[PDB]
Paper text:
The HH ligand is secreted into the extracellular space by a cell surface protein named Dispatched-1 ([name]). [name] is a well-studied isoform that contains 1,524 amino acid residues, including a ∼170-residue N-terminal intracellular domain (NTD), 12 transmembrane helices (TMs), two extracellular domains (ECDs), and a ∼300-residue C-terminal intracellular domain (CTD). As a member of the resistance–nodulation–division (RND) transporters, [name] shares a similar topology with PTCH1, NPC1, and bacterial efflux transporters such as AcrB. TMs 2-6 of [name] form the sterol-sensing domain (SSD), which is widely conserved among polytopic membrane proteins involved in cholesterol metabolism and transport (e.g., PTCH1 and NPC1).
The construct referred to as [name]* with an N-terminal truncation (Δ1-171) and a C-terminal truncation (Δ1249-1524) yielded high expression in HEK cells with ideal behavior in a detergent solution. The structure of [name]* was determined at 4.5-Å resolution; because of the higher local resolution, the TMs are well modeled and most aromatic residues could be assigned. Because the [name]* protein appears as two bands on an SDS–PAGE and the loop region 253–292 is invisible in the cryo-EM map, we speculated that the recombinant [name]* was cleaved by Furin, which is consistent with a previous study showing that Furin-mediated cleavage is required for [name] maturation and localization. The ECDs of PTCH1 and NPC1 twist together to create an intermolecular tunnel for cholesterol transport; in contrast, ECD-I of [name]* is shifted from ECD-II by more than 15 Å, which is not observed in either NPC1 or PTCH1, leading to an open conformation of the two ECDs in [name]*. On the other hand, the loop between residues 253–292, which is absent in both PTCH1 and NPC1, is disordered in the map, indicating that the flexibility of this large loop permits it to be accessible to Furin and the cleavage by Furin may release this internal loop to facilitate the endosomal trafficking of [name]. An internal C2 symmetry is found in the TMs of [name]*. Similar to the sterol-like molecules found in the TMs of PTCH1, five sterol-like molecules are observed in the TMs of [name]. We tentatively assign these molecules as cholesteryl hemisuccinate (CHS) based on the density shapes and the hydrophobic environment that is created by potential binding residues. One is found in the sterol-binding pocket of the SSD (site 1), and two are found near the N terminus of TM12 (site 2). There are two novel sterol-binding sites in [name]*: One is located in the pocket created by TMs 7-10 (site 3) in a position that is symmetrically related to the sterol in the SSD.
Residue numbers in the entry: 179 to 252, 295 to 305, 313 to 338, 348 to 389, 415 to 441, 447 to 476, 485 to 662, 688 to 770, ...
The structure:
């Protein structure tokens, strides 16, 4: 009644009140929001509300505070630039041919200084300024000085001033051969220092295919490159509209479904920012468009043919009955498909990183509201179509009709002449792929990152430099493990907003009792010093536990305070004299006393220590390191008294928790995606053999995805989480619509049922598969890795999933398939 009546009664009014909602949403969507910034590409990737993040951001909060006077009132520069994008020495003309280039339009003189560092450097012999090709002296000096000494480092004086180190600091280090190709690309520039001005010269004097660069414009050039990034999807959306127009035989419908998708995205953005107060907006929210123009148009293809399939079968009776029947059937199928997809992102939200959460919410609301709009624009497409050179058009129409029937008769014949074969070949592929690509070496975590990921394609300069400079700055440091007791580590800030961290909170219950708890810290420090894994070969620190300096200062000064006798009784004023003793600087943290707008005595007892292991940018060892130290500190704080009960562990390991949060977040997202997948598959089709069939198909297709995906050197960094979520969403998206379509077959046979059911499902889905495939494939040519990544991903997923779901379900339904309602429960 309600739907169909409202549809048939006033279509222009529902059109009006809808478009009203869209235009007002757009207006407010421009008025209120305070300019979503794209300055930092990876803005706010610090995982929040996850111990380490909390404990880190507390000690990080400690850094930005300390707002007082004293608390005792009483050359080849690393920052310069370089090209370096492969080291040979036939630089007879090349070196200064690189020099006389676009590095002089804006001088910006620093440290005109002759800034070659290879060319003028090699020419240290004579001439003083210019690039000079003195062949015999060049070769003889180069070959000699290259073969003099490399590895064994004021006992040997053959060089000029400071030569050797500087020589071996520009050119590639892999020259330890003791022995003697052309690309016109090497390591030279060492120009004026990097920053923003370097952007200005780059943008103005590059992007003409002119020796690739590194001078830290990645984070700004990315933001500017969003123009030609924005360009490509415009071609993607018009072409998907065009091919949709080719199929459904009505230009109006297809324009309206397209405008519906874009309206659905902007109404999602309004509903996102206005109600779900999230001031942050990362870049992946843009890639939402690309994922939404593939699956957003899908539902439409399941509608038009349904409307067409009834108006032929049912006899021109009246509009209301036809729209009612088509709507109830198409709506079940459209809700299940869209919700199953949306649920992935909505579940993915349970992850505890900032950007993925934000992206998930936005795309989630986008896919869900898209369904509402699709159902509410059904009336429009159908009823407007009711009240609606040409020779070539009619030939095309004949071709289109003929080809659809050609398809309709062939595909069932081919999929049934499969004859138990496609089952074997594809099952063997999946189990084989999966069982190898989920045990042995196949993937890793984003180790070579340091919060500097691949934000562009490998063909472009800035990424490729990673591989180039792999030929340096990395020093084997020890983990400054620092338990502090100074402040209650509680995150009093909005978890979603990355720009507001919070403020420190003092612990009034924490009071170093002057007569007590000193012997505790001593026995604790002794207990540590006796425990292993404590690197203590160096002895010239003098600030290790803070008690030693105390023991020295109570030992001295007695031979102002002027009251020191035996061990600590009154205290306070002696601690203050010891503060003076320390102050007589290296004052930042590094020492335990009161800071951060404090006029009174001790409130922070910031203790320092050294480590066992080295700073790697990978998992494994760091986790075992963390676990062991946390488990030890958790014991020693269990031995602690009432006066000091609160302490925790922290060091410089932001990267470790990023990896841990990503790994957990993906797992729990995957877990809920498979859970809702099974649940909703049960909701649509009431038999269970079909439900197992489904989940096996889901398992197979996903194991194709993250096996084929990774083999393309694609470890799980940041996006790969939400991709895996898409993969589960779109796998079941196909499976479901196959399912009910089988269940509702007129005959009680196992082959005629297949043929009919198959020919149906194929005709909806293959077109919708093609729709997505083109929408994804067209995005492959671009610069930013984000778009390339998601575009080529979802392309592969659809390309697999459709034909996967197709041939599995039907080859499985051929022989092993269900009979007279075997397994259905009321
Ligand atoms: C999903 C597809 C359709 C791409 C998304 C389209 C737009 C929502 C984005 C893409 C490019 C973005 C623009 C990229 C560059 C800038 C310049 C920016 O200016 C500054 O950075 C401040 C001054 C300066 O540094 O130059 C103001 C926002 C703006 C217009 C951005 C606003 C939002 C835009 C238009
Ligand atoms: C349309 C009909 C005839 C079915 C055929 C499907 C193909 C068109 C699909 C199946 C596998 C897909 C390929 C799977 C893997 C890749 C590798 C990938 O190559 C890269 O490594 C580029 C990424 C990078 O190095 O930056 C680019 C897309 C491509 C060729 C895909 C493009 C589309 C392909 C060829
Ligand atoms: C949809 C599915 C297929 C996605 C799976 C992708 C990742 C979430 C997987 C692939 C690699 C897995 C990691 C491979 C290796 C390990 C080491 C493992 O270490 C131990 O076994 C501890 C004991 C020891 O060996 O010392 C802990 C889990 C972890 C991080 C795994 C966690 C889950 C990861 C990140
Ligand atoms: C529906 C089925 C029957 C046809 C469509 C399946 C394809 C979408 C899949 C099947 C196997 C996949 C391929 C498996 C292996 C590779 C090789 C891989 O590249 C390499 O391993 C480089 C070679 C080397 O390592 O020496 C790139 C992805 C690719 C082409 C995969 C891309 C997608 C493919 C072609
Ligand atoms: C077109 C391809 C892509 C298939 C995609 C699925 C839907 C379009 C199919 C699945 C089940 C089909 C329905 C199966 C049964 C019927 C009952 C039929 O009404 C009758 O009961 C008439 C029986 C008779 O007198 O023969 C009207 C069409 C309808 C809704 C079918 C319309 C098309 C549906 C919804
Ligand atoms: C607290 C404690 O047990 N300290 C002992 C110390 O008495 C002993 O002199 C030393 C010999 O190496 O070993 C330490 O661990």
């Amino acid at each position: 009644k309600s739907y169909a009546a409202l549809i048939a009664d006033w279509p222009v009014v529902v059109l009006g009140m809808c478009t009203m909602f869209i235009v007002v949403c757009a207006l407010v969507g421009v008025l209120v929001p305070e300019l979503p910034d794209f300055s930092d590409p990876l803005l706010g990737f610090e995982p929040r509300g996850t111990a380490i993040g909390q404990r880190l951001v507390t000690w990080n909060n400690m850094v930005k505070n300390t707002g007082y006077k004293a608390t005792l009132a009483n050359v080849p520069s690393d920052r310069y630039s370089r090209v370096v994008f492969l080291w040979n020495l036939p630089a007879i003309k090349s070196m200064c041919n690189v020099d006389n280039s676009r590095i002089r339009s804006h001088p910006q003189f620093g440290d005109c200084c002759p800034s070659w560092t290879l060319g003028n450097y090699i020419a240290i012999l004579n001439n003083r300024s210019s690039c000079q090709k003195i062949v015999e002296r060049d070769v003889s000096h180069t070959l000699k000085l290259l073969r003099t000494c490399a590895k064994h480092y004021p006992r040997k004086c053959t060089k000029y001033n400071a030569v050797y180190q500087i020589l071996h600091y520009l050119v590639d280090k892999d020259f330890m051969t003791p022995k003697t190709p052309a690309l016109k690309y090497s390591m030279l520039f060492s120009p004026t220092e990097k920053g923003e001005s370097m952007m200005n010269i780059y943008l103005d004097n590059f992007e003409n295919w002119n020796t690739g660069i590194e001078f830290g414009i990645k984070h700004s050039l990315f933001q500017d490159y969003l123009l030609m990034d924005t360009v490509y999807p415009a071609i993607a959306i018009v072409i998907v509209l065009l091919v949709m127009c080719v199929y459904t035989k009505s230009m109006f419908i297809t324009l309206m479904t397209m405008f519906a998708i874009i309206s659905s995205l902007i109404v999602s953005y309004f509903l996102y920012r206005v109600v779900f107060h999230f001031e942050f907006f990362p870049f992946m929210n843009l890639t939402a468009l690309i994922i939404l123009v593939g699956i957003g148009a899908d539902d439409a293809f399941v509608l038009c043919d349904v409307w067409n399939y009834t108006k032929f079968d049912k006899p021109h009776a009246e509009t209301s009955e036809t729209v009612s029947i088509t709507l109830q059937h198409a709506a079940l199928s459209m809700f299940v498909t869209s919700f199953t997809t949306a649920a992935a992102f909505y579940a993915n939200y349970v992850s505890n990183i900032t950007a993925i959460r934000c992206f998930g919410v936005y795309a989630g609301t986008a896919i869900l509201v898209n369904y509402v709009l699709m159902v509410t624009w059904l009336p429009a497409v159908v009823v407007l179509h009711e009240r609606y050179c040409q020779k070539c058009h009619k030939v095309l129409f004949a071709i289109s009709e003929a080809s659809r029937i050609f398809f309709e008769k062939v595909l069932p014949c081919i999929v049934i002449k499969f004859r138990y074969l496609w089952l074997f070949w594809f099952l063997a592929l999946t189990v084989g792929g999966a069982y190898i690509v989920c045990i042995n070496p196949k993937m890793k975590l984003p180790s070579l990152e340091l919060s500097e990921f691949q934000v562009f394609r490998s063909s472009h300069p800035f990424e490729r430099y990673d591989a180039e400079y792999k030929k340096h700055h990395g020093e084997e440091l020890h983990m400054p493990i620092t338990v502090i007791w100074g402040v209650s580590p509680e995150d009093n800030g909005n978890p979603l907003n990355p720009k507001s961290k919070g403020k420190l909170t003092l612990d009034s219950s924490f009071n170093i009792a002057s007569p007590a708890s000193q012997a505790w810290i001593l026995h604790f420090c002794q207990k540590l010093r006796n425990q292993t894994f404590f690197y203590q070969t160096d002895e010239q620190d003098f600030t290790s536990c803070f008690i030693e300096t105390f023991k020295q200062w109570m030992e001295n000064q007695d031979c102002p305070c002027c009251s020191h006798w035996s061990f600590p009784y009154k205290q306070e004023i002696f601690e203050l004299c010891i503060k003076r003793a320390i102050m007589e600087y290296h004052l930042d943290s590094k020492t335990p006393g009161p800071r951060f707008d404090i006029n009174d005595t001790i409130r922070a007892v910031v203790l320092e220590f050294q480590s066992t292991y080295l700073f790697t940018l990978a998992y494994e060892k760091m986790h075992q390191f963390y676990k062991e130290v946390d488990s030890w500190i958790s014991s020693e704080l269990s031995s602690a008294p009432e006066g000091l009960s609160n302490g925790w562990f922290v060091s410089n390991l932001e990267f470790y928790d990023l990896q841990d949060s990503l790994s957990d977040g993906t797992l729990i997202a995957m877990g809920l995606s498979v859970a809702v997948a099974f649940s909703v598959m049960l909701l649509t089709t009431w038999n269970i053999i079909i439900s197992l069939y489904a989940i096996i198909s889901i398992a197979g297709t996903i194991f194709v995805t993250v096996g084929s995906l990774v083999l393309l050197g694609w470890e799980l960094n940041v996006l790969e989480s939400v991709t895996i979520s898409v993969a589960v969403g779109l796998s079941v998206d196909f499976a479901v619509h196959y399912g009910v379509a089988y269940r509702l077959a007129p005959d009680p046979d196992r082959e005629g049922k297949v043929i009919f059911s198959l020919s149906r499902v194929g005709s909806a889905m293959a077109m919708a598969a093609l729709t997505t495939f083109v929408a994804g494939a067209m995005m492959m040519p671009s610069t930013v890795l984000a778009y390339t990544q998601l575009g080529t991903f979802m392309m592969l997923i659809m390309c697999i999933s459709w034909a996967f779901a197709t041939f599995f379900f039907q080859c499985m339904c051929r022989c092993l398939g269900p009979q007279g309602t075997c397994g259905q429960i009321p």
